[PDB]
């Protein structure tokens, strides 16, 4: 069927139900939508994952796609996620690019040759930007408590509070699921002067 062209070639023989359902929606969005009609026929996804918790009653749907289409997705986002959420009630849809990480070598000569996009620090901060994409990070803090615990807090602009606050508890869960690290969120009115909202 023509709708299978929206999946990676390896998954076309025996697709899963979630992958098949997403592929069907994308193909219908291809010929129906006006803005999405362009830039869609060059796109295909890798896999679809689903997560949930006893709290955060909504379900998280994570879609991974090849890194080449990151420029394509950036212009298309804020509309693809809106339409996908309409066709999947009860779920929150996230688009994340699949990236590779190079383990830190031990020799100084080998370390000097490592490509910096494949560094673990660079990869994790890019996955965070893939989440909450229409907003951007305006600040970041690390707190070291008296016990060995360490916390990382990420601040967002308070102007986007009405459009992103509902998804913050679920997006922290997805970030932990992908990177095995925890993040806390805050809002900053007047980020220039470092004023925290309350």
């Amino acid at each position: 069927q023509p709708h299978l062209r929206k999946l990676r070639k390896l998954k076309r023989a025996n697709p899963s139900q979630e992958e098949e359902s997403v592929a069907r929606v994308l193909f219908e969005l291809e010929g129906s939508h006006k803005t999405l009609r362009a830039q869609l026929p060059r796109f295909h996804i890798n896999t679809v994952r689903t997560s949930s918790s006893p709290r955060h009653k909504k379900t998280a749907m994570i879609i991974l796609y090849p890194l080449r289409f990151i420029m394509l997705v950036r212009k298309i986002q804020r509309t693809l996620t809106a339409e996908l959420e309409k066709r999947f009630p009860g779920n929150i849809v996230v688009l994340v690019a699949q990236r590779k990480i190079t383990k830190r070598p031990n020799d100084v000569y080998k370390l000097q040759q490592v490509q910096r996009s494949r560094t673990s620090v660079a990869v994790f901060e890019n996955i965070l930007n893939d989440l909450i994409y229409p907003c951007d990070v305006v600040g970041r803090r690390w707190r070291y408590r008296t016990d060995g615990s360490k916390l990382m807090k990420v601040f967002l602009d308070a102007r986007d509070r009405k459009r992103v606050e509902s998804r913050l508890p679920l997006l922290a869960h997805v970030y932990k699921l992908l990177t095995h690290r925890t993040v806390t969120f805050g809002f900053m009115w007047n980020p220039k002067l470092q004023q925290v909202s309350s």
């Binding site: 803090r141 690390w142 408590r145 008296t146």
Partner: protein, 129 residues
């Protein structure tokens, strides 16, 4: 120009505790600075501290509880054999009952009491008591 980030940071903390301040701002930060502060905090000498990100070398805000008498760096970083711990304790510490000398070893940055337990030498970084 500034030649040692660690020496600069330890001078700011010791100066603030002499004046009886509650908080101190340290700039710039580094990996060695954070590890040194984590050793002090584990033994209960400073308290909570926070790192601020600015896409350059960061900044640190430290809370002081008034228990720290003096801290300082040792320049240059002399080598210390595992049998030489008593010589350094006798020279730069108030007594043999309290206070720590901080070393950098192949197992990481640690105080001289832990290094003796693991039987490792290294290079002396500083002290606090």
């Amino acid at each position: 120009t500034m030649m040692s980030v660690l020496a600069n940071a330890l001078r700011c903390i010791a100066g603030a505790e002499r004046r009886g301040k509650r908080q101190v701002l340290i700039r710039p930060s580094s990996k060695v600075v954070v590890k040194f502060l984590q050793v002090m905090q584990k033994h209960g000498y400073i308290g909570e501290f926070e790192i601020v990100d600015d896409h350059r070398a960061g900044k640190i805000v430290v809370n002081l509880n008034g228990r720290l008498n003096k801290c300082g760096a040792i320049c240059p970083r002399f080598d210390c054999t595992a049998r030489d711990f008593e010589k350094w304790v006798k020279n730069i510490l108030p007594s043999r009952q309290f206070g720590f000398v901080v070393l950098t070893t192949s197992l990481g940055i640690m105080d001289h009491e832990e290094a003796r337990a693991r039987n490792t030498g290294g290079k002396v970084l500083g002290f606090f008591y």
